């Protein structure tokens, strides 16, 4: 087999300086590269690491058309909701996984990077919608949520609320209220050729035998 070369951009995803708010989660498409998943699955850094529809023992010798890395910041208590068939404000209104998801959820605590004294209010989540998200939908709408029966004028007031809250990430928050950075890897196969594959191992070359 040829030299291991053109390794996938997981460093650009996992070691980005700036992450998204969970209501406006970023998606990166990974394609046409060698994915060594070993640098993820046997890293001790992650607090959560688990996969659905695949064992990590069967990564590194599977091929896919595309991989999507979706990424955002949430409370450490909410990482619970980033799984198939869950419910709560994050699963219902911010980021929904399919029930038949094939992919991995990875998370790590980040209160050294993106918490500060007096709070880091730069991260937000939807607190309200008229309905739940469907799988892999995003909603960046800002329109004032009319919560009660009274027709709202399109501005904040009684029974009519601004739809996003902000996280109060103090560095002294208890572990469930700390920030966590999350990456969700979603794997797909189409009738297009596979472009993302695990690294091919090679033996030595022996001659005259």
């Amino acid at each position: 087999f040829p030299n291991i070369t053109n390794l996938c951009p997981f460093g650009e995803v996992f070691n980005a300086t700036r992450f998204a708010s969970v209501y406006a989660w970023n998606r990166k498409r990974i394609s046409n590269c060698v994915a060594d998943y070993s640098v993820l699955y046997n890293s001790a850094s992650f607090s959560t690491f688990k996969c659905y529809g695949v064992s990590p023992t069967k990564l590194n010798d599977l091929c896919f058309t595309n991989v999507y890395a979706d990424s955002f910041v949430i409370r450490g208590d909410e990482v619970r909701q980033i799984a198939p068939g869950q419910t709560g404000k994050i699963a219902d209104y911010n980021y929904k996984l399919p029930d038949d998801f094939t992919g991995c959820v990875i998370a790590w605590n980040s209160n050294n990077l993106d918490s500060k004294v007096g709070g880091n209010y730069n991260y937000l989540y939807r607190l309200f919608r008229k309905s739940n998200l469907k799988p892999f939908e995003r909603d960046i709408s800002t329109e004032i949520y009319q919560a009660g029966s009274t027709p709202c004028n399109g501005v904040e007031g009684f029974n009519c609320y601004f739809p996003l809250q902000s996280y109060g990430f103090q560095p002294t928050n208890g572990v469930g209220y700390q920030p966590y950075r999350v990456v969700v890897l979603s794997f797909e196969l189409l009738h297009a050729p596979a472009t993302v594959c695990g690294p091919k191992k090679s033996t030595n070359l022996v001659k005259n035998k």
Partner: antibody, heavy 118, light 111 residues
Framework: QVQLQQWGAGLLKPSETLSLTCAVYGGSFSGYYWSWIRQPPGKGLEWIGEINHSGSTNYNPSLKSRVTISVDTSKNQFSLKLSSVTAADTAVYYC????????????WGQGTTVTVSS | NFMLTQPHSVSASPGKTVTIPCTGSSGNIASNYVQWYQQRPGSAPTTVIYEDNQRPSGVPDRFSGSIDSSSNSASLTISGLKTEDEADYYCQSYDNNIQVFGGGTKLTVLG
């Protein structure tokens, strides 16, 4: 296919040093996680420590102060020293393999009974 | 810090179904995979569940695993007991670079 075979002195007395060896047949160290695990008489399993893929040690913080794990790659062989033993170190000791960091203990050595008694 | 706890013993008559619980504490059990091992007396353990739901090749479909992120609990179900199922059962997981085992449950098949 892969087999773990272990040996060492089982009968010891207090303040000696335990020294167990485990050897791998039908396979090799480099890609996998290798651990020592113990089971006191009539009690549950306790993980002592490991060698990761490529050979760095990690230890259970409760035993880290007096334990040493090392690989002799020339023999596909690795060992546990556990120093200044007490009667509480009396257990069956197993070497075991794990395929990746958070995976199952997929292969186990045959065990070795250690009795610490004056 | 993180700990798994199990009942000391469980029993039912042959042909019935039993569930063995495994409860997490000082952390959340759903964050990493859970394994279950069977240990028959005087021998090394063997895995019967190897990721939360997943059963090894050569293990009977009578054994099934589950997990519950609301109860902070895993469980092992053995369904249609045989007298050969009588053994210790241990749950296990990873946290904070330590491998943690539950205290073990003796299953007796009530003969």
């Amino acid at each position: 296919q892969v087999q773990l075979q272990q040996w060492g002195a089982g009968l010891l007395k207090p303040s000696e040093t335990l020294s167990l060896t485990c050897a791998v047949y039908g396979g090799s160290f480099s890609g996998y996680y290798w651990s020592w695990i113990r089971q006191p008489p009539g009690k549950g399993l306790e993980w002592i420590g490991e060698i990761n893929h490529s050979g760095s040690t990690n230890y259970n913080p409760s035993l880290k102060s007096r334990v040493t794990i090392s690989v002799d790659t020339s023999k596909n062989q690795f060992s546990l020293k556990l120093s200044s033993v007490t009667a509480a170190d009396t257990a069956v000791y197993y070497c075991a393999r794990r395929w990746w960091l958070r995976g199952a203990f997929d292969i186990w050595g045959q065990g070795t009974t250690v009795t610490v008694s004056s | 810090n993180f700990m798994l706890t199990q009942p000391h013993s469980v029993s039912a008559s042959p042909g019935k179904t039993v569930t063995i619980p495994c409860t997490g504490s000082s952390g959340n059990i759903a964050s990493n995979y859970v394994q279950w091992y069977q240990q028959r007396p005087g021998s090394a353990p063997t895995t019967v569940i190897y990721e939360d739901n997943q059963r090894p090749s050569g293990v009977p479909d009578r054994f099934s695993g589950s997990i519950d992120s609301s109860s902070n609990s895993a469980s092992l179900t053995i369904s249609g007991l045989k007298t050969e199922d009588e053994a210790d059962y241990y749950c296990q997981s990873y946290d904070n670079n330590i491998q943690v085992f539950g205290g073990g449950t003796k299953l007796t098949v009530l003969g």
